[PDB]
């Protein structure tokens, strides 16, 4: 179907970037992230009040930036007024597309539902191939599938009760992956986790692994034991997965 995504070697991408040692959804974490190694990048996207498409992941700007304020309710040039960390100003998905190398991949989880449209135009002129369009929020699934029927599409999932859903979403919005987070494991418990991935292969869904704190990788050989079940994984530490996954032997470089 689609040859980057659908790959043989694994697929690392930088959590925000770069989110472990550069300032998170900024300019500089993602050039930073490819040249570690990293396949592209996931980043969250608002919609600001004059319609530009923004990298946020909050959906205000206080804890990243130095100043205050919600980014749905503000104009982009009260937004490149902010510094987010080493003189970085809050980038435009237009600016992201311009920054990464064409055939890099860019996972782009939509945070607001009202981005859906202006996101599906802006990646139809930047090679949608490599562009991965993920969600909690179904309704933004849905709302960009009005635009783009195409595109590959991942369901982020945080609550238990969202998986007996899949098989329908599945077909609603015609989903490539569903990205599951390493806190399951323990939240749920390994063997509770490792069969409900297994059931959403069985439906013919891709796999990417997400986590807030890396370590969820590491210990107890978690991802490990998860080898040959996932496509993807999101790291906040680019550096440290790319070495760990060529440590196991799986990826070159």
């Known amino acids: 179907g ?37 396949d592209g990048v996931e980043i969250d996207v608002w919609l600001s009040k004059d319609n530009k498409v923004i990298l946020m992941h909050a959906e205000t700007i206080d804890r990243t930036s130095n100043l205050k304020g919600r980014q749905k309710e503000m104009t982009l040039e009260e937004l490149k007024k902010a510094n987010i960390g080493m003189g970085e100003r809050i980038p435009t998905l237009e600016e992201v597309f311009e920054i990464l190398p064409k055939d890099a991949l860019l996972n782009i989880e939509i945070k607001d539902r009202d981005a859906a449209k202006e996101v599906a135009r802006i990646v139809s002129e930047n090679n949608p191939e490599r562009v991965m369009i993920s969600s909690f929020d179904i309704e933004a ?26 098989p329908k979403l599945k077909e609603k919005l015609n989903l490539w992956s569903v990205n599951v987070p390493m806190e399951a494991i323990p939240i749920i418990g390994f063997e509770k986790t490792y069969q409900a ?20 990788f590491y210990v107890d050989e978690n991802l490990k034991r998860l080898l040959g079940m996932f496509e993807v994984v999101i790291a906040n530490d680019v550096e440290r997965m790319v070495s760990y996954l060529s440590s196991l032997g799986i990826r070159l470089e």
Do not use: C, F, Q
């Open 197 to 216: 991935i297994k059931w959403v292969r069985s439906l013919g869904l891709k796999i990417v692994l997400w986590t807030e704190d890396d370590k969820l």
């Open 141 to 166: 699934l849905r709302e960009y599938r009005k635009y783009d029927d195409t595109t590959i599409m991942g369901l982020l999932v945080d609550k238990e009760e969202t998986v007996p859903l899949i």
């Open 2 to 38: 689609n040859p980057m995504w659908e790959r043989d070697k694994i697929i690392v991408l930088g959590h925000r970037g770069y989110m472990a040692k550069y300032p998170e959804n900024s300019l500089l974490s993602i050039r930073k992230a490819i040249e570690a190694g990293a």
